[PDB]
Amino acid sequence: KLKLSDWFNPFKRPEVVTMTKWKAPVVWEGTYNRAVLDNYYAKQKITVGLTVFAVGRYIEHYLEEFLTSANKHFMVGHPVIFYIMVDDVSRMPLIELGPLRSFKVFKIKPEKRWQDISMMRMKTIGEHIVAHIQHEVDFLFCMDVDQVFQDKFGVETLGESVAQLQAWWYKADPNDFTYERRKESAAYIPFGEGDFYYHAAIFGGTPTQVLNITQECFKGILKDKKNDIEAQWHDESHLNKYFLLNKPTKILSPEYCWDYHIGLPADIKLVKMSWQTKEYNVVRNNV
């Protein structure tokens, strides 16, 4: 029965949004007491999971760097299981893992369109939750592979449902967010609505919550298909609709998923994860 103020002090970061109107914390560098949390979670003997997909040349371009950096920086001090989904196991980089890390690899079907590779993750993650992850971990993160951990990404990020503020939009007004705006899409969010723009590169929660996130997003994806529409930002559009309806119980600041193309402004104090430069001419095979 951890209490928010046990570990979270919004006053340490007075110039950024630290609490939502539904009283979920927005976790910024300086606001969290990791020691308090490491002790608490170690006493419950938690395990944390991490899913990552790499299909096609995303394997060679990003998977090693992702996993090497995750080994070093993700939930250090707690058992972690990396679940790696690839279309060709023969190209899996098999790095050395450190204390309290282990992994397993699964072969998946490569979808033809990169858009569908990205969106089908929703289906696949749920399948894996039901079959095994629910029995293996207390919390799970689902992440894009095209990014690199830069510093500690620890238990301060854990919660029932966890969303990532997207780096380019965190100070914007909702009517500037790139939600899907066509009412024919299941991902539709009208003008005048919206809390934040969440990044689909990182989301998480307990296995139960992540099952519901992924299942509801995939239902939307499938519905759109039947209506011959494809959301503007694919699974991210659906994820944003989900989290509008089912508010996240924790949000991570853009420090947890930063685009250095923006530079490094005052609000980004310690970067925990950075985007890789895009290489679509090589890693994608369709428009």
Ligand X SMILES: O=c1ccn([C@@H]2O[C@H](COP(=O)(O)OP(=O)(O)O)[C@@H](O)[C@H]2O)c(=O)[nH]1
Please give the structure tokens belonging to residue 73.
């920086």
Using CB under 6 A as the binding rule, the residues of this chain from 196 to 255 that contact ligand X are 201
Residues 6+ away with beta carbon under 8 Å from 18: 10, 25, 26, 28, 31
Q: Which is nearer to ligand X, 73 or 284 (CB)?
A: 284
| Helix or strand run (H / E) with residue 207 | helix 207-226
Would you call 156 a catalytic residue per the annotation?
Answer: no
Please give the structure tokens belonging to residue 261.
């193309």
Answer for the pair 15, 267: CB distance below 8 angstroms, yes or no. Answer: yes
Q: Which is nearer to ligand X, 101 or 199 (CB)?
A: 199
Tell me whether residue 281 is annotated as binding: yes
Residue 146 in the binding site for Mn ion (CB under 5 A): yes
Query: What is the closest distance, in whole angstroms, from the C-beta atom of residue 37 to ligand X in the complex?
Result: 28
Please identify which residue in 29, 146, 156, 255 interacts with ligand X, judged by CB under 6 A.
146
Find, among 144, 112, 97, the residue nearest to 125 by Cα. 144
Residue 29 in the binding site for ligand X (CB under 6 A): no
Residue 255 in the binding site for Mn ion (CB under 5 A): no
Which stretch, 5-13, 89-97, 135-143, 197-205, contacts Mn ion (CB under 5 A)? 197-205
Q: Which is nearer to ligand X, 146 or 230 (CB)?
A: 146
Residue 96: how many CA atoms within 13 Å on its side-chain side? 1
Alpha carbon distance 140, 47 (integer Å) = 9
Using CB under 6 A as the binding rule, the residues of this chain from 100 to 129 that contact ligand X are 114, 117-118
Size of the site for ligand X (CB under 6 A): 14
Residue 164 in the binding site for ligand X (CB under 6 A): no
DSSP labels, 21-47 = TT--BEE-TTSB-HHHHHHHHHHHT--
Please give the structure tokens belonging to residue 53.
């997909």
Query: What is the closest distance, in whole angstroms, from the C-beta atom of residue 261 to Mn ion in the complex?
Result: 13
Please identify which residue in 26, 27, 54, 155 interacts with ligand X, judged by CB under 6 A.
54
Q: Which is nearer to ligand X, 78 or 199 (CB)?
A: 199
Q: Strand 26-27's sheet: what is its strand order?
A: 26-27, 250-252, 161-165, 198-205, 139-143, 48-54, 80-86, 101-107
Active-site residue among 156, 230, 236, 255? Answer: 236
Tell me whether residue 198 is annotated as binding: no
Which stretch, 65-73, 97-105, 124-132, 199-207, contacts Mn ion (CB under 5 A)? 199-207
Which stretch, 25-33, 88-96, 144-152, 220-228, contacts ligand X (CB under 6 A)? 144-152
Query: What is the closest distance, in whole angstroms, from the C-beta atom of residue 115 to ligand X in the complex?
Result: 8
Q: Which is nearer to ligand X, 225 or 278 (CB)?
A: 278
Residue nearest to ligand X (CB): 144
Answer for the pair 103, 49: CB distance below 8 angstroms, yes or no. Answer: no
Please give the C-alpha separations between residue 262 and each of 11, 150, 168, 225, 268, in angstroms, as whole numbers: 26, 16, 8, 34, 11
Query: How many other C-beta atoms lie within 10 A of the C-beta of residue 176?
Result: 11
Alpha carbon distance 87, 178 (integer Å) = 31
* Binding site as annotated, residues for Mn(2+): 144, 146
Q: Annotated catalytic sites, by residue?
A: 236
- Please give the residue ranges that form the binding site for ligand X (CB under 6 A): 53-56, 58, 114, 117-118, 144-146, 201, 278, 284
